[PDB]
Nucleic acid binder design. Structure first.
Lengths: 100, 65, 65, 116, 88
RNA sequence: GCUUGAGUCUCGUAGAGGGGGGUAGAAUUCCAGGUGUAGCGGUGAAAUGCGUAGAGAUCUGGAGGAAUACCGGUGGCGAAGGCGGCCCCCUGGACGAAGACUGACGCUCAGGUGCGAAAGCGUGGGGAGCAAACAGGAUUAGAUACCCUGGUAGUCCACGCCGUAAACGAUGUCGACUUGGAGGUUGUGCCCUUGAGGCGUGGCUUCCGGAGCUAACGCGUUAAGUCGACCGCCUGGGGAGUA
């Protein structure tokens, strides 16, 4: 099916929600017959500019494969969630493994 | 000069920010290919890696951040 | 752009970084969208740049001195 | 009063006039002087010498605050912008940083028409 | 438009075999699927004039093949336009 | 009948091709607050304008609109008009390698049909900046202009209308043929990828020049050379692309 390269940052003060947030997303993916290729979390790293007067966001890479209407429910989840700033749904022809 | 991206068969992705900071100048602007000597195909996808890294705060837009 | 150098004070080392692209940009955003003259000036530029290439290559025959 | 030690010296560097002001690290101002208020009016407001007299007139009336070190911010394509800073290190200051903070739009609002 | 498994499907019913992919009968039925699918694209958006030229190119291409098939074998022409539904 | 024209398919590749939705940063303006004090702004000079009711400068926060620095390239794509941040969805064409397939299905068209910069128009929004008109200040013999300070339609969005440009390469479309050189961009084959190497081969594109052509300027394998197919068009200047 379609390949995707999702990277979304998370509000620091909610970093203990992150392994809960991660398994929330992949349960919707593999429960809709979705392959997964990566879960490479990068931890809290320094921003280049302040996103909403704030530094040191928590970065989460997924790089998952899903049908395009299943992921269409996923970015609107990133909209209505204050703990997520700057999602980025993306794409390659052949999603891959460890890259950083 | 030459293009090291054409020396290999790799792909310039936005996540490899260690090799992108020698392609921007000291104020965040992209260095032209007439200085660096990159091929025109890889220079076009290099700026697509600069612009995606600027969105995800891995690289700054200006130096006033 | 940002010089926080030590020792003896002499911007001298500042105008190297600053007169690079901090006045040509502000003098051309100074007025007029142009929308088509950039094109004219741009296309007049490189017709005079290859005028420096195709004449100075043909100027190395002799110099009459 | 507050007797602050380190400050910031912003330099506005328009074509017709140069404004130099002195603030602190927090960003609220202390004193200012312009080239139009130093006795230079009209054609002589656009002179680097008039930006020097605006600097030493601003280097005074901040003796009340006791600044010995300051940063330098320059903004605008002015005829001053560097003769102003030479009138500050000669005035007994420790210039830690000199920074260009001129506003460059990444292509935004439309400028006016070229005058003929 | 007209993905790879769909193009392999149409060449089976209209062609002689799976490798007879160029005949005048399979070409009309292949263009008809690309015509009929892009009506859903041009139901909405409607202002895609740069893509409608591609549709109008293959609409006029199908008429130039149907006029050729009527000139060669009229028995296969009446067989084909009934099998798709054509002539207004 | 045949496969060489034309077209289909199988793999790929590049792209500001188009339509729809989201979103980011820089900057202008405005609003609010802090600090701060007599100037700011503008010009060849000056004034109008702004400011002691606290401007301008500076800092924090907010609102909103439009445009996407650097990359950016006699670079790319599109039939032309045209198209530049980033991400997704839908979608058009071009091109290359190796084959397979249909078998002249082609070329060009009066009328017709569609597309078609900017300005303008209609209805409904939006309105930062810019800015016809208009208003004031200058300059001037006069200035109805150039310059200055303001500033409304308009520029923006949706849906229609308009159907015009120095809409230009001032060069219609298609096909064939005829010395070269330097490049750009984008596929691909082989050999020692043994090294950004060497040899090729396509597509589009820029420049300079040979023959020949042209009144000359120039054009020159992307012809304005040598030919063929069809179409549009021209017939002294004004009157007039007007009645």
């Amino acid at each position: 099916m379609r390949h995707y390269e999702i990277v979304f940052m998370v509000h620091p003060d909610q970093s203990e929600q992150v392994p809960g947030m991660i398994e929330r997303y992949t349960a919707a993916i593999t429960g809709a017959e979705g392959k997964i290729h990566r879960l490479e979390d990068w931890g809290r790293r320094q921003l280049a500019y302040p996103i909403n007067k704030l530094h040191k966001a928590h970065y989460v890479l997924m790089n998952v494969e899903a049908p395009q209407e299943v992921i269409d429910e996923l970015e609107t989840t990133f909209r209505f969630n204050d703990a997520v700033i700057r999602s980025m749904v993306m794409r390659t022809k052949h999603a891959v493994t460890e890259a950083s | 000069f030459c293009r090291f991206t054409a020396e290999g068969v790799q792909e310039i992705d936005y996540k490899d920010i260690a090799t992108l900071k020698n392609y921007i100048t000291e104020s965040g602007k992209i260095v032209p290919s007439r200085i660096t000597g990159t091929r025109a195909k890889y220079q076009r996808q290099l700026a697509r890696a600069i612009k995606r890294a600027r969105y995800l705060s891995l690289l700054p837009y200006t130096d006033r951040h | 752009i940002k010089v926080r150098e030590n020792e003896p004070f002499d911007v001298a080392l500042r105008r190297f970084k600053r007169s690079c692209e901090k006045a040509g940009v502000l003098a051309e955003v100074r007025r007029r969208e142009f929308y088509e003259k950039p094109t004219t000036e741009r296309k007049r530029a490189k017709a005079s740049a290859v005028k420096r290439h195709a004449k100075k290559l043909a100027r190395e025959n002799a110099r009459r001195t | 009063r507050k007797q602050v030690s380190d400050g910031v010296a912003h330099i506005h560097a328009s074509f017709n006039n140069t404004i130099v002001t002195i603030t602190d690290r927090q960003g609220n101002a202390l004193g200012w002087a312009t080239a139009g208020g130093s006795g230079f009016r009209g054609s002589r407001k656009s002179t680097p010498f008039a930006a020097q007299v605006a600097a030493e007139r601003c280097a005074d009336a901040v003796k009340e605050y006791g600044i010995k070190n300051l940063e330098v911010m320059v903004k605008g394509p002015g005829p001053g912008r560097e003769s102003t800073i030479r009138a500050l290190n000669a005035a007994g200051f420790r210039i830690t940083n000199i920074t260009d903070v001129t506003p460059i739009p990444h292509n935004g609002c439309r400028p006016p028409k070229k005058r003929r | 438009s007209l993905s790879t498994e769909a193009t392999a499907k149409i060449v089976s019913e209209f062609g002689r075999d799976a490798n007879d992919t160029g005949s005048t009968e399979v070409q009309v039925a292949l263009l008809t699927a690309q015509i009929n699918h892009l009506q859903g694209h041009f139901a909405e958006h409607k202002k895609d004039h740069h893509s409608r030229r591609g549709l109008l190119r293959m609409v006029s291409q199908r008429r130039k093949l149907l006029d050729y098939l009527k000139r060669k074998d009229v028995a296969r022409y009446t067989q084909l336009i009934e099998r798709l539904g054509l002539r207004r």
